[PDB]
Write a protein that binds this ligand. Structure first.
Ligand code: HEM
Ligand code: HEM
Ligand SMILES: [O-][O-]
Ligand SMILES: [O-][O-]
Ligand SMILES: [O-][O-]
Ligand SMILES: [O-][O-]
Ligand SMILES: [Cl-]
Ligand SMILES: [Cl-]
Ligand SMILES: [Cl-]
Ligand SMILES: [Cl-]
Ligand SMILES: [Co+2]
Ligand SMILES: [Co+2]
Ligand SMILES: [Co+2]
Ligand SMILES: [Co+2]
Ligand code: NA
Ligand code: NA
Ligand code: NA
Ligand code: NA
Lengths: 263, 263, 263, 263
């Protein structure tokens, strides 16, 4: 009776200018698995709420998998587009396990690792980030990658990643909105380097509200505003990591592993 | 943040003439719990399929509970309108347990017992069945109650119930379409009683397709057709047990117990 | 790495005169599966406590399965010698599921049905009980089988069984210490039959404390004492059903099904 | 009926010279919770096997918790003395969850975080490691901390920790036997620093076989042997991190959090 499906799961975005990076990921998946149905879900409640408000279907992972059981899928590979295996990724794993083996439902539900899975992923991410840098960035000019940050233990992925980036370039820095390293830590790194021009790039899949507001906003407490007050030319780049082929390739490999775990 | 909901779950029916017994149960629940939201789900895949085909929303228990988590419910009392704790009732229990405690989802999901829960329910069902008999049934005229039957061990509820019915009336008989006692067992009971007029009543919540076709159909292998060939005046009664107040009261008590199990 | 084991689980007994029926079951299992290791566990806490007090190892199902994981077993078939799928049997099922698939532990843990599993088992039990009757019991003399009884819904197995027994012999009766039918129900059955000699047989695997005390005790409230006060010659028979080959054969078949469910 | 217990879980050691660090942890726990029973278990199969071979009881976490359920404990706080939340720590979490809520068993089983739990733990570990250094280590002399390493994603804790250590001292280095950073990575760090005297300290709770053999062994492929071949005075220090009060204090705090999670 066998039927295989793929569930792509993003934190998500509700802003029109940011959704293209999701669609680009959808194409990549379709191109690599032309005969497997692909469905979407979103882990953030507030974003499902805004998307429904605009008249767009936006299922939670639970709704998506109940709907997929209803369409007769038996084996589903779930791939998050999270960066780290934090709270949301763990919740997604609990949700997948809960659906597998329910009566008359899904036989097998596998979950692909987020971006920074193994130490080998972390080193591959560092390389992909380097390959993603804007052509106009000059050698010596620091780049701050902005991650979300979390109180979850997987926060340790950000300082782990900083290790790998430095092995490539002493001027590539990691900062987070809510964890460690903090933006203050990043500014202290910038002061010792006496950098005059600094690039800012989101570490998340899509350049969402943290990217547009906390990293590059007009208000005083944004990263670019804070850098301007200390005389630094801030160059924010509003592209999520899902726009990079070299980064996306790592999510794709994770999806391949999850499909293979279905048998 | 607390919010309590009730999920009523029927095997279900897709035939217009049979759905009124479901609506009657919905009223009873509303009348007994005027301030608790009440939602519906259906355990039979083929029936969800026919209802969707007619343009009617018919969620599986999984879809229903994912939707309810999405509306912000935290504590849900699930009540099946199954007759016995067989395969479908067990699947419903697995499905409820799977949803409870998922991240950002339902805190507590309780499940009410089907009709024949304890031996005290079984005795109460026997009494309610007796109270439900048509006024025109005469003393001495046998009544055959038709249950579904199952290969599941809960099939033992049918012969258990027969025990309780006989304590009340030697001429009340239990038969099933797919289990034990069989219709052949019932006919052998009828032969020793030399009964000339026999009543047939569904044991299920709604007088569905088994009631209209297997019990009372025009075709040769229906119960009434088989009784007519042996010279018995068959009186089929097309009312599910959900139409009886005395029977419905037992499902209601089960729902009260399940609400109390939420705290 | 594969290694298959069998876990036999009894409610248990702590009285020397009753343990032989367990040993007889152990032989039967060894004889039918000569190359599979067989281990024991007991569901009753008070009995594990008395056996430890006498210096006898008596593991709970949890201790047994943790020990078996430790010896390198990978696939274990658990067979209860319970009569009905009540509270204890359900707890055993939860305990088996909990062990299967734990890291570096058991791959597969299956559970065999108790005696009264399907309606087909129930009919086979009725036949086996009849075959087990003492040769001196005369036709027409009632036999009361004593079951435990439980508030669990599986109590419905006792009146279910009574149905099957009556199909064979109108004078075979089922009574229970704690459920339905009650001993009062049995005495009302005896009064209408005006029986002068009545046989009492335990329905449980071993003739334990309920058999020696509640059924056949010297005190006033025992079954035999109550029957003597109403002028009935009570003939108690202190053999658990595990002593009968015809009954044991049903547990053995259940164990075969559970072994096959391992693959 | 309430009864609270503490389960201390070590990877473990089977070598006499190394077990004192476990006993020191046992005292610390007893001293901080004088009225709570404390039990031991070990996650490594090969070590349970060697300890049983020497006649010492060495239960797996499953055996321990089944035994504790048997003694009447209801609420158990499990604390691993693992360094990272890798494969073994995850297995321990699965095992604890499996025991909680089993019939007549443990009501609540909580699990304390391993050493490197949050980014705040990671920074506290870095500080504790610094405080643990031998008094004879001179400023400027590098120290290599040896961790296990794992293919599990929690391997990212080692490069995460390296980040925190460097914030304190550019000459503190992290290396692992089986993950990243590798010993080759550490030697390349040593070459750029042209270090003549290097200290080696185990990162694990006990200075076990990896410490005595892979880090400080006489054979050619040991860390100290490899450093001697390149003209470096290697100073191995055979004390597990459990010997340090400043490090142990972090495990103790984790145990406090796990006790509080019992209510
Ligand atoms: C007449 C036979 C059976 C009856 C009357 C019955 C009834 C029930 C009921 C009423 C519950 C509610 C849970 C509770 O009391 O806490 C339950 C739970 C459950 N049942 Fe059944 N059941 C039967 C046979 C089985 C069988 C054959 C299986 C497995 C093959 C099974 C598996 C379970 C499981 C896994 C649960 C939830 C946790 C637990 O084991 O208590 N039951 N059952
Ligand atoms: C750096 C990577 C990882 C870290 C730091 C980590 C850490 C943790 C921690 C600290 C917990 C405690 C539970 C809680 O917070 O409530 C946890 C729970 C859990 N973890 Fe991990 N983990 C990682 C990767 C993984 C992976 C790859 C898997 C699966 C393959 C996994 C599976 C689980 C599961 C099933 C639980 C229990 C329920 C849940 O999903 O929250 N973790 N993990
Ligand atoms: O986090 O907003
Ligand atoms: O059963 O149709
Ligand atoms: O039940 O004793
Ligand atoms: O790892 O030995
Ligand atoms: Cl310039
Ligand atoms: Cl007439
Ligand atoms: Cl005589
Ligand atoms: Cl010197
Ligand atoms: Co945020
Ligand atoms: Co049917
Ligand atoms: Co008892
Ligand atoms: Co090792
Ligand atoms: Na991020
Ligand atoms: Na029925
Ligand atoms: Na019994
Ligand atoms: Na380590």
């Amino acid at each position: 009776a066998q039927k295989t499906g793929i569930l792509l799961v993003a934190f998500g975005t509700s802003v029109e200018e940011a959704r293209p990076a999701l669609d680009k990921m959808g194409d990549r998946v379709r191109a690599a698995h032309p005969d497997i149905p692909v469905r979407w879900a979103y882990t953030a409640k507030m974003i499902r709420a805004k998307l429904r408000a605009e008249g767009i279907a936006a299922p939670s992972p639970a709704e998506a998998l109940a709907g997929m059981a209803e369409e007769g899928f038996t084996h589903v590979a779930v791939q998050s587009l999270h960066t780290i295996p934090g709270e949301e990724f763990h919740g997604l794993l609990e949700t997948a396990h809960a659906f597998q083996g329910l009566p008359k439902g899904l036989t097998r539900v596998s979950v692909g690792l987020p971006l920074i899975g193994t130490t080998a992923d972390a080193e591959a991410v560092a390389e992909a980030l380097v390959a993603s840098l804007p052509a106009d960035r000059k050698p010596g000019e620091p780049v701050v990658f902005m991650g979300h940050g979390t109180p979850h233990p997987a926060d340790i992925c950000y300082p782990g990643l900083q290790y790998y980036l430095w092995r490539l370039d002493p001027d590539l820095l990691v900062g987070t909105v809510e964890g460690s390293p903090s933006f203050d830590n990043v500014m202290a790194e910038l002061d010792v380097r006496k950098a005059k021009r600094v690039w800012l790039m989101p570490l998340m899949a899509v350049a969402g509200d943290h990217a547009r507001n906390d990293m590059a906003g007009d208000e005083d407490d944004s990263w670019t505003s804070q850098l301007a007050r200390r005389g630094i030319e801030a160059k924010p780049v509003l592209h999520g990591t899902a726009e990079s082929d070299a980064v996306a390739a790592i999510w794709l490999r994770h999806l391949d592993d999850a499909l293979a775990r279905l048998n």
